[PDB]
Amino acid sequence: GDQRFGDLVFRQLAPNVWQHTSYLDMPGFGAVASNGLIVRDGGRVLVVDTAWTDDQTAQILNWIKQEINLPVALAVVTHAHQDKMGGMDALHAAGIATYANALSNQLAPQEGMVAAQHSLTFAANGWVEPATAPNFGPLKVFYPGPGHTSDNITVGIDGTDIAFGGCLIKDSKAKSLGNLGDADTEHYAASARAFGAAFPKASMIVMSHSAPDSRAAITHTARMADKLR
Numbered sequence: 309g310d311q312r313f314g315d316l317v318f319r320q321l322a323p324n325v326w327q328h329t330s331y332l333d334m335p336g337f338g339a340v341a342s343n344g345l346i347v348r349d350g351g352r353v354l355v356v357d358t359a360w361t362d363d364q365t366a367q368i369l370n371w372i373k374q375e376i377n378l379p380v381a382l383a384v385v386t387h388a389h390q391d392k393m394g395g396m397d398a399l400h401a402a403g404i405a406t407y408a409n410a411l412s413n414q415l416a417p418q419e420g421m422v423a424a425q426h427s428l429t430f431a432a433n434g435w436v437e438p439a440t441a442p443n444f445g446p447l448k449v450f451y452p453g454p455g456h457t458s459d460n461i462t463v464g465i466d467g468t469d470i471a472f473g474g475c476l477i478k479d480s481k482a483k484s485l486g487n488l489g490d491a492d493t494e495h496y497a498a499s500a501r502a503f504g505a506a507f508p509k510a511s512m513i514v515m516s517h518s519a520p521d522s523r524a525a526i527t528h529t530a531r532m533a534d535k536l537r
């Protein structure tokens with residue numbers, strides 16, 4: 309099921325969707341996995357999140373070239389942390405248009421990241437303003453509210469039963485909400501539930517640090533976050 313390519317792992321989730329996995333070795337802690345997505349939309353490819361580094365992200369582009377052999381139209385990055393935006397330079401060097409929440413772009417310098425080249429903005433209910441997400445095809449971007457970070461965004465894949473929660477969502481058997489360093493403990497539970505309500509028919513929930521899970525990943529994350537309030 310899992311395909312090893314260089315230092316990365318690729319898993320096909322649907323006929324047109326793959327999960328990319330990259331690892332960062334943390335001294336005395338062990339290797340930390342981070343997941344993103346690759347979506348084929350006809351004659352082009354769309355990417356959600358970079359890998360931890362530029363070299364790992366260049367390896368994602370190399371896998372796309374070999375396995376799909378279609379051009380990457382754009383990438384969406386889900387917040388200004390290393391696991392999601394660490395490889396922006398490799399996207400830019402390749403000529404790929406990059407998009408992130410305007411807030412992620414504003415926080416990127418303080419977070420030691422390079423901003424995406426375009427900014428997404430959101431309505432009062434969390435849905436992306438469509439003029440800011442042109443020709444996004446099946447990528448349905450939703451800002452669920454502050455949680456893992458104040459800028460965290462999520463992506464539903466239209467035409468599939470998949471939705472990507474990024475670092476906001478943890479798996480159904482997680483014992484904690486992960487790095488809470490930049491988190492909004494007050495609003496986390498409502499943000500997790502808002503992601504679930506935005507994509508109510510998504511049955512496969514993809515996240516940054518666990519393998520794809522059922523909707524119990526959303527409800528369990530919300531239940532752990534209810535304890536932070």
Ligand SMILES: Nc1cc(-c2nn[nH]n2)c(S(N)(=O)=O)cc1S(N)(=O)=O
Binds near residue numbers: 389390391456485487
């Ligand atoms: N272990 C780890 C977990 C998280 C995490 N993400 N979501 N929940 N926790 C993050 S993140 N996205 O930066 O906040 C980074 C690391 S590290 N120190 O780079 O290994």
Ligand SMILES: [Zn+2]
Binds near residue numbers: 387
């Ligand atoms: Zn993060």
